[PDB]
Amino acid sequence: KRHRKVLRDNIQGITKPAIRRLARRGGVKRISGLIYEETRGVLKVFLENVIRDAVTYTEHAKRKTVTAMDVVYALKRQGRTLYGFGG
C-alpha cells in the first residue's frame, strides 16, 4: 500500500451554515459569531469520547474495522442509546 493523505483540520468541515442549520432544528433564531468555534469544540469532545470507546470495542474483538455495533455499544455505554443500526 502506497501513501495515504494526511488528515488535518477537518473540524472545519463542520461549517458555519451546517451549525446554523443544526441550531435551527434546535429552535434557535439568532446566533453569536463565537458560537461556531464553540460548537466545533463541543462536537470534537463528543466524537472523541464515543470514538474512543467504539475503537476500544473494535480492538477487544481483535478487528481492524470499527462496526456499526461498536458505535451502538459505545453510544449505549455513554447513555446515548441509538436505535436503527442494529442496536
Partner: protein, 94 residues
C-alpha cells in the same frame, strides 16, 4: 449465520392495529432496536431483583416487578394485565 429479529412479529402486530399500514425497513430496524432494548432493560431489572432476593430463578413474578420498576404509570398497568393474562392462559392450556 442466521441473524434473528422480531420483524415478523412486529409485522403481525402492525397488521392487527393498522391493517392497511406498512413499515419501511429503517422503521422496522428501529422497532427491532426498541424490542431488544426493552427486553434487555426488563431482563436486567429482573436479574438484579432476583439477585437482591437471593433467588436463582427468574419467574413471571420478577418480570412483573421489573415491568413495574421500568415502565411509566399507565404503560406498566396495561403491560401487567397483558402479561398476567398471558400467563394465566398459558397455564390453563395443558
Amino acid at each position: 449465520t442466521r441473524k434473528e429479529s422480531y420483524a415478523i412479529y412486529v409485522y403481525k402486530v402492525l397488521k392487527q392495529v393498522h391493517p392497511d399500514t406498512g413499515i419501511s425497513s429503517k422503521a422496522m430496524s428501529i422497532m427491532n432496536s426498541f424490542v431488544n432494548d426493552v427486553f434487555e432493560r426488563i431482563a436486567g431489572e429482573a436479574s438484579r431483583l432476583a439477585h437482591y432476593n437471593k433467588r436463582s430463578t427468574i419467574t413471571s413474578r420478577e418480570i412483573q416487578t421489573a415491568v413495574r420498576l421500568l415502565l411509566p404509570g399507565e404503560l406498566a398497568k396495561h403491560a401487567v394485565s397483558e402479561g398476567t393474562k398471558a400467563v394465566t392462559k398459558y397455564t390453563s392450556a395443558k
